Design an enzyme around this catalytic site. Structure first.
Site, PDB file in Angstrom:
ATOM      1  N   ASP A 200      30.822  25.957  32.232  1.00  0.00           N
ATOM      2  CA  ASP A 200      31.195  27.402  32.212  1.00  0.00           C
ATOM      3  C   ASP A 200      30.022  28.142  31.551  1.00  0.00           C
ATOM      4  O   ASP A 200      30.205  28.916  30.591  1.00  0.00           O
ATOM      5  CB  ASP A 200      32.519  27.538  31.403  1.00  0.00           C
ATOM      6  CG  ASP A 200      33.171  28.944  31.400  1.00  0.00           C
ATOM      7  OD1 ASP A 200      32.940  29.698  32.333  1.00  0.00           O
ATOM      8  OD2 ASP A 200      33.984  29.199  30.425  1.00  0.00           O
TER       9      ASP A 200
HETATM   10  C1  LIG Z   1      32.164  33.382  33.190  1.00  0.00           C
HETATM   11  O1  LIG Z   1      32.739  33.606  34.443  1.00  0.00           O
HETATM   12  C2  LIG Z   1      33.415  34.861  34.497  1.00  0.00           C
HETATM   13  C3  LIG Z   1      34.895  34.674  34.908  1.00  0.00           C
HETATM   14  O2  LIG Z   1      35.292  33.859  33.797  1.00  0.00           O
HETATM   15  C4  LIG Z   1      35.453  32.468  34.186  1.00  0.00           C
HETATM   16  O3  LIG Z   1      36.397  32.458  35.243  1.00  0.00           O
HETATM   17  C5  LIG Z   1      36.410  31.166  35.826  1.00  0.00           C
HETATM   18  C6  LIG Z   1      37.095  31.281  37.190  1.00  0.00           C
HETATM   19  C7  LIG Z   1      37.215  30.275  34.859  1.00  0.00           C
HETATM   20  O4  LIG Z   1      37.211  28.854  35.181  1.00  0.00           O
HETATM   21  C8  LIG Z   1      38.295  28.330  35.977  1.00  0.00           C
HETATM   22  C9  LIG Z   1      37.824  27.156  36.871  1.00  0.00           C
HETATM   23  C10 LIG Z   1      37.836  25.838  36.174  1.00  0.00           C
HETATM   24  C11 LIG Z   1      37.635  24.714  37.175  1.00  0.00           C
HETATM   25  O5  LIG Z   1      36.865  25.924  35.148  1.00  0.00           O
HETATM   26  C12 LIG Z   1      39.233  25.690  35.616  1.00  0.00           C
HETATM   27  O6  LIG Z   1      39.331  24.421  34.897  1.00  0.00           O
HETATM   28  C13 LIG Z   1      39.414  26.846  34.643  1.00  0.00           C
HETATM   29  C14 LIG Z   1      40.853  26.699  34.153  1.00  0.00           C
HETATM   30  O7  LIG Z   1      39.503  28.140  35.243  1.00  0.00           O
HETATM   31  C15 LIG Z   1      36.355  30.212  33.562  1.00  0.00           C
HETATM   32  N1  LIG Z   1      36.980  29.610  32.328  1.00  0.00           N
HETATM   33  C16 LIG Z   1      38.444  29.632  32.391  1.00  0.00           C
HETATM   34  C17 LIG Z   1      36.639  28.171  32.390  1.00  0.00           C
HETATM   35  C18 LIG Z   1      36.042  31.643  33.076  1.00  0.00           C
HETATM   36  O8  LIG Z   1      35.196  31.663  31.909  1.00  0.00           O
HETATM   37  C19 LIG Z   1      35.691  36.002  34.886  1.00  0.00           C
HETATM   38  C20 LIG Z   1      36.960  35.451  35.538  1.00  0.00           C
HETATM   39  C21 LIG Z   1      37.398  34.913  36.899  1.00  0.00           C
HETATM   40  O9  LIG Z   1      36.379  35.225  37.518  1.00  0.00           O
HETATM   41  C22 LIG Z   1      35.620  36.709  33.501  1.00  0.00           C
HETATM   42  C23 LIG Z   1      36.671  37.909  33.515  1.00  0.00           C
HETATM   43  C24 LIG Z   1      36.525  38.409  32.030  1.00  0.00           C
HETATM   44  C25 LIG Z   1      36.286  39.001  34.550  1.00  0.00           C
HETATM   45  O10 LIG Z   1      37.066  40.174  34.189  1.00  0.00           O
HETATM   46  C26 LIG Z   1      38.233  40.344  34.975  1.00  0.00           C
HETATM   47  C27 LIG Z   1      39.298  41.243  34.356  1.00  0.00           C
HETATM   48  C28 LIG Z   1      40.603  41.064  35.126  1.00  0.00           C
HETATM   49  C29 LIG Z   1      40.037  41.539  36.451  1.00  0.00           C
HETATM   50  N2  LIG Z   1      41.032  41.605  37.540  1.00  0.00           N
HETATM   51  C30 LIG Z   1      41.882  40.413  37.617  1.00  0.00           C
HETATM   52  C31 LIG Z   1      42.016  42.664  37.424  1.00  0.00           C
HETATM   53  C32 LIG Z   1      38.968  40.681  37.099  1.00  0.00           C
HETATM   54  C33 LIG Z   1      38.530  40.965  38.504  1.00  0.00           C
HETATM   55  O11 LIG Z   1      37.828  40.612  36.274  1.00  0.00           O
HETATM   56  C34 LIG Z   1      34.868  39.404  34.242  1.00  0.00           C
HETATM   57  C35 LIG Z   1      34.110  39.408  35.416  1.00  0.00           C
HETATM   58  C36 LIG Z   1      32.654  39.809  35.431  1.00  0.00           C
HETATM   59  C37 LIG Z   1      31.866  39.804  36.572  1.00  0.00           C
HETATM   60  C38 LIG Z   1      30.388  39.981  36.454  1.00  0.00           C
HETATM   61  C39 LIG Z   1      29.742  38.694  36.913  1.00  0.00           C
HETATM   62  C40 LIG Z   1      28.257  38.885  36.772  1.00  0.00           C
HETATM   63  O12 LIG Z   1      30.112  37.744  35.894  1.00  0.00           O
HETATM   64  C41 LIG Z   1      30.289  36.483  36.388  1.00  0.00           C
HETATM   65  O13 LIG Z   1      30.093  36.068  37.536  1.00  0.00           O
HETATM   66  C42 LIG Z   1      31.151  35.745  35.409  1.00  0.00           C
HETATM   67  C43 LIG Z   1      32.669  35.741  35.517  1.00  0.00           C
HETATM   68  O14 LIG Z   1      32.900  35.375  36.803  1.00  0.00           O
HETATM   69 MG   LIG Z   2      34.197  31.506  26.791  1.00  0.00          MG
HETATM   70 MG   LIG Z   3      36.894  28.073  27.587  1.00  0.00          MG
END
Ligand SMILES: CO[C@@H]1[C@@H](O[C@@H]2O[C@H](C)[C@@H](O[C@H]3C[C@@](C)(O)[C@@H](O)[C@H](C)O3)[C@H](N(C)C)[C@H]2O)[C@@H](CC=O)C[C@@H](C)[C@@H](O[C@H]2CC[C@H](N(C)C)[C@@H](C)O2)/C=C/C=C/C[C@@H](C)OC(=O)C[C@H]1O
Ligand SMILES: [Mg+2]
Ligand SMILES: [Mg+2]
Ligand SMILES: Nc1nc2c(ncn2[C@@H]2O[C@H](COP(=O)(O)OP(=O)(O)O)[C@@H](O)[C@H]2O)c(=O)[nH]1
Length: 299
Positions: A200
């Site tokens: 991650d």
């Molecule tokens: C670090 O990655 C980030 C991801 O955060 C990660 O999201 C993965 C899917 C999760 O991993 C998964 C897969 C796995 C196999 O690791 C599994 O074991 C684990 C349980 O889960 C992982 N953590 C849980 C391990 C988590 O850090 C998101 C979440 C899902 O994407 C963080 C939220 C705060 C999101 O902010 C939000 C706000 C809410 C909003 N929306 C829903 C309304 C959304 C669109 O964006 C912020 C988004 C920012 C986007 C800008 C781009 C440049 O930034 C990136 O590309 C990085 C991000 O994608």
């Molecule tokens: Mg973290």
């Molecule tokens: Mg974590």
């Protein structure tokens, strides 16, 4: 809504951490943990990691095992060294430096500490250093623990299975699915070695010094031995092909495992990011992320 100051004081007290209340600072950037920075009555400064949901602490077992390995064998970067670890609280001393960026939930994206309008070359170069070092920790040391360890074909079959599972649960847009399958079915694009990954890697974990040199990494719940490609994905997401290229170049030049279609493979893995979004939706139970997953999967 997460724990407030008085609740944090009580949790800390139960764990023999007696905090100076006026020093408590909250950091809500994490989806799994609330973080608190605070100094105690002994003058000692802490990071306090407080789980947000039932699914969170069970995922920390591997994390602690991976940190034991990384703290023992890493030479050029820091990782958390947990002092307190119970089902209610993880605590450790804050790493040096600051995160290269941190999520602000009011905008759903990063507040950057580096010049996003011109990323320092030292950042890519040094992340390359850190990743090649990490990915070189011998896999047998991870297998002796409860960490997931994939051979190169196991990594491929794991992806196949995870895709199948999300398709069964959510569906997958037909064009996206065809793209995924064409990647799976193209032998030449896959790595022929695996290594210990962080799993991650993103700006919010990447601690840097004043020169944007990476000095540490936090949050190791996804560590395992598998395709190293995952640890390059954020550089592509944030910094595009050019940023991915810079990281690959530095990694290759310092001795990291490289194969000819590495960049293309990483881009396909990025196209499979919806698999990971879906899995987070299922593990967390958070309704908004189920919606996100359906959008991401092009259902
Ligand atoms: C670090 O990655 C980030 C991801 O955060 C990660 O999201 C993965 C899917 C999760 O991993 C998964 C897969 C796995 C196999 O690791 C599994 O074991 C684990 C349980 O889960 C992982 N953590 C849980 C391990 C988590 O850090 C998101 C979440 C899902 O994407 C963080 C939220 C705060 C999101 O902010 C939000 C706000 C809410 C909003 N929306 C829903 C309304 C959304 C669109 O964006 C912020 C988004 C920012 C986007 C800008 C781009 C440049 O930034 C990136 O590309 C990085 C991000 O994608
Ligand atoms: Mg973290
Ligand atoms: Mg974590
Ligand atoms: N500056 C700094 N921030 C930290 C440290 N440890 C945790 N954090 C912050 O606390 C947040 C949540 O911790 P993390 O382990 O990533 O939780 P998760 O993402 O919810 O699994 C991170 O996003 C960081 O902003 C540290 O040692 N230094």
């Amino acid at each position: 809504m997460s724990k407030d100051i008085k609740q944090v004081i009580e949790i800390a007290k139960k764990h023999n951490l007696f905090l100076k209340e006026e020093t408590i600072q909250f950091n809500e950037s994490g989806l799994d943990f609330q973080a608190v920075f605070a100094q105690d009555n002994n003058g000692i400064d802490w990071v306090l990691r407080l789980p947000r949901r039932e699914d969170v602490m069970p995922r920390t077992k591997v994390e602690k095992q991976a940190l034991d390995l990384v703290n023992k064998y890493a030479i050029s970067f820091q990782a958390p060294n947990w002092i307190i670890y119970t089902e209610e609280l993880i605590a450790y001393k804050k790493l040096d430096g600051v995160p290269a960026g941190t999520i602000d939930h009011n905008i759903g994206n990063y507040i950057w500490e580096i010049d996003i309008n011109n990323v320092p070359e030292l950042f890519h170069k040094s992340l390359g250093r850190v990743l090649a070092e990490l990915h070189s920790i011998p896999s047998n040391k991870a297998a002796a623990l409860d960490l997931v360890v994939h051979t190169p074909e196991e990594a491929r079959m794991s992806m196949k299975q995870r895709m199948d599972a999300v398709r069964a649960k959510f569906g997958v847009g037909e064009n996206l699915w065809n793209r995924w399958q064409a990647w799976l079915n193209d032998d030449d694009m896959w790595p022929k070695k695996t290594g210990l990954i962080h799993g991650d890697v993103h700006a919010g974990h990447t601690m840097i010094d004043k020169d944007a040199n990476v000095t540490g990494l936090i949050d190791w719940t996804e560590a395992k031995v598998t395709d190293v490609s995952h640890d390059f994905i954020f550089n592509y997401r944030a910094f595009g092909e050019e940023g991915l290229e810079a990281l690959i170049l530095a990694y290759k030049e310092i001795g990291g495992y490289y194969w000819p279609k590495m960049k293309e493979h990483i881009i396909e893995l990025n196209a499979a990011y919806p698999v990971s979004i879906a899995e987070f939706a299922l593990v967390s139970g958070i309704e908004e992320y189920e919606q996100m997953a359906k959008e991401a999967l092009e259902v």
